[PDB]
Amino acid sequence: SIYNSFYVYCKGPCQRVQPGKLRVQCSTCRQATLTLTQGPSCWDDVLIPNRMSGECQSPHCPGTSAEFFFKCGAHPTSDKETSVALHLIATNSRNITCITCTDVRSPVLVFQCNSRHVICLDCFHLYCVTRLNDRQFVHDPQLGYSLPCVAGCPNSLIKELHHFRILGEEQYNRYQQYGAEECVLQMGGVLCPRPGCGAGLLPEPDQRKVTCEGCGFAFCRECKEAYHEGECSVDERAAEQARWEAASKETIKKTTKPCPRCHVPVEKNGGCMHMKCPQPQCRLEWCWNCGCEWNRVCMGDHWFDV
Ligand SMILES: [Zn+2]
Ligand SMILES: [Zn+2]
Ligand SMILES: [Zn+2]
Ligand SMILES: [Zn+2]
Ligand SMILES: [Zn+2]
Ligand SMILES: [Zn+2]
Ligand SMILES: [Zn+2]
Ligand SMILES: [Zn+2]
């Protein structure tokens, strides 16, 4: 790829976040024969069922609805070996600094708070690991546990929980255990402190000696050491800058570009990368990013960008 807009979680063989390929088919016959009236321009166009329409080219098909899906892009995949799109992950083409480390990194994760706060994937990982350690995940009745924007913005819980799969197997399994453990702790219990154990334990609440009976560890529930007698031994400017829609400096890529064929300056007016030259006698169709005739590789890698 010259450029990727999209990231998926590849469940096998990669077992990690990868660049993804976008596909559309006819929702009626399920073949790749749907010519869209208008190309996708944002996540809602490709995630909301039946949102986009066109015409199915299959002879005896009346289908007019699009169905979009994604595949891992790191190796060959079959026609419909699909993967879940991690729609919060964006390529950082405008060099936005990260809300917590202030470095320019790519890809980044964009929270769905009003501010659309930006955090790099390393800090997102660190943020999850910290919150797990400190027991700071947030409960949602219709979701389970998740995290809001790091800046604490309202209405910003991650809803698509495959985004936590990017923590990789061990942190992801700590995340998965969180709720069971939390139930124990709300009830006044205690987790075994032995690394690799962590059983949830519900001893009589006035007992200082807790025996894990898992691993047999007898501990002091106060200091968490082996049982003994006697006494135990976001920056404010960062969060203004690290916002997806905040005004930015000019990059090497211009926001007004010449048509590849007729050289007349063209303005882009939404998220679709498929441009149609507005000049009557030109009408070249081209990729805004790659500056070449519109094609299926551009479709797959970056039909739209955020
Ligand atoms: Zn893969
Ligand atoms: Zn069809
Ligand atoms: Zn960072
Ligand atoms: Zn926020
Ligand atoms: Zn234990
Ligand atoms: Zn103690
Ligand atoms: Zn032109
Ligand atoms: Zn392109």
| Domain segments of the chain as ranges | 1-306
Distance 30 CA to ligand 2 centre (A): 6
Degrees to nearest 5, angle at CA 226 with 225 and 231: 70
Ligand nearest to the CA of 209: 6
Q: Which residues pair with 55 in a beta bridge?
A: 35
> Of the candidates 25, 10, 121, which has an alpha carbon nearest to the alpha carbon of residue 64?
25
Q: Where are the alpha helices (DSSP H) in 20-137?
A: 43-47, 121-133
Report how far residue 222's alpha carbon sits from residue 203's, in angstroms, rounded to the nearest whole number.
13
Q: Which residues are 9's β-sheet partners?
A: 17, 84
**Rounded Cα–Cα distance for residues 20 and 24 (Å):** 13
Round to whole Å and give the CA distance between 174 and 221. 21
Instruction: Give the residue ranges of DSSP H helices in 26-65.
Output: 43-47
Q: How far apart are CA 131 and CA 114, in angstroms?
A: 22
Long-range CB contacts for residues 250-254, cutoff 8 Å, separation at least 24: 251/93, 251/94, 251/95, 253/93
Closest CA to 200 of 189, 208, 211, 210: 189
Sign of CA dihedral 139, 141, 145, 149: negative
Cis status of the peptide bond prior to 49, with omega within 30 of 0: no
Cα 182 to Cα 273: distance, rounded to the nearest angstrom: 45
SS (H, E, C) 108-164: EEECCCCCCEEEEHHHHHHHHHHHHHCCCCEEECCCEEECCCCCCCCCCCCCCHHHH
Cα-based distances in Å from 296 to 23, 186, 252, 293: 10, 53, 25, 10
* Beta carbons of 27 and 46 less than 8 angstroms apart: no
Report which DSSP code applies to 165.
Answer: G
Q: How many angstroms separate the alpha carbon of residue 80 from the centre of ligand 5?
A: 44
Contact partners, residue 254, CB within 8 Å, separation at least 6 = none
**Which backbone phi and psi does 122 adopt, to 5 degrees?**
-60, -50
Resolution stated for this PDB structure, in Å = 2.0
Q: How far is the centre of ligand 5, averaged over its atoms, from the C-alpha of 228 (Å)?
A: 17
Looking up tokens 């709720």 gives: 179
Active site positions, annotated? 272
Smallest-distance ligand from the CA of 222: 6
Find the 12 Cα to ligand 1 centroid distance in Å: 6
* Ligand number, closest to the Cα atom of 224: 6
